[PDB]
């Protein structure tokens, strides 16, 4: 028996990032946590751009991804973005935990299109680790550009991972698991190592015992 849950607090902290530079953009989702935005590493396929963060509070525009300070999660398609101090921070109400096998998750998505936003909760699905643990597999159909959307456990309502990649036939879907002591990484600066100008210049990346493409 698991407690019935309202997923609206998690929806209120989902943000839509769009890194645009010279007519080419990369749009995927993220999560708002204080002065930080947790999102996928493959958001930075291009360097020197303009980040557009769309939150429930407002829409923000940021100077140059090269100057941006980012903490990279080791061996995972995850990155912590340090927003400049002028941007208002979000709630620290989001709860991150390492996923547990045989624990069901639901993809929580916010629909920015409709005049009234919809806190969408997908159908439940089990999770299993893939190869070295860089990727975790779920059975929730995800459209393109839906990476960074939170995988939320139905037991305790914690974000256990963010969506990342899928196969070309769109039959298996892989998300990036939240690492151990990830909440310790958010509230303790001594564990954070910030880097600037990180970008993914390569077309093909070899991650998680797989060959992942950008398109």
């Amino acid at each position: 028996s698991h407690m019935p849950r309202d997923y609206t607090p998690i929806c209120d902290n989902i943000v839509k990032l769009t890194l645009t530079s010279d007519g080419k953009s990369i749009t995927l989702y993220g999560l708002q946590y204080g002065n930080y935005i947790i999102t996928n590493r493959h958001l930075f396929r291009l360097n020197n751009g303009t980040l557009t963060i769309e939150s429930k509070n407002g829409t923000y525009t940021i100077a140059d991804s090269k100057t941006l300070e980012v903490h990279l999660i080791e061996g995972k398609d995850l990155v912590i973005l340090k927003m400049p101090d002028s941007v208002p921070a979000a709630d620290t109400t989001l709860k991150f935990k390492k996923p547990v096998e045989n624990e069901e998750v639901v993809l929580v998505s916010r629909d920015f299109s409709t005049p009234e936003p919809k806190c969408l909760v997908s159908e439940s699905s089990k999770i299993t680790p893939d190869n070295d643990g860089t990727f975790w597999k779920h059975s929730i159909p995800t459209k393109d550009g839906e990476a960074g959307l939170p995988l939320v456990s139905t037991k305790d309502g914690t974000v256990v991972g963010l969506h990342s990649a899928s196969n070309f036939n769109n039959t298996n879907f892989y998300f990036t698991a939240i690492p151990e002591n990830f909440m310790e990484l958010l509230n303790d600066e001594s564990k954070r190592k910030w880097i600037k100008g990180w970008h993914l210049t390569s077309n093909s990346v070899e991650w998680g015992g797989h060959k992942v493409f950008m398109d």
Binding site: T142, A165, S166, H210, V212, D215
Partner: peptide
Amino acid sequence: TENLYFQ
């Protein structure tokens, strides 16, 4: 194993 593409 199987090839993937980012989303």
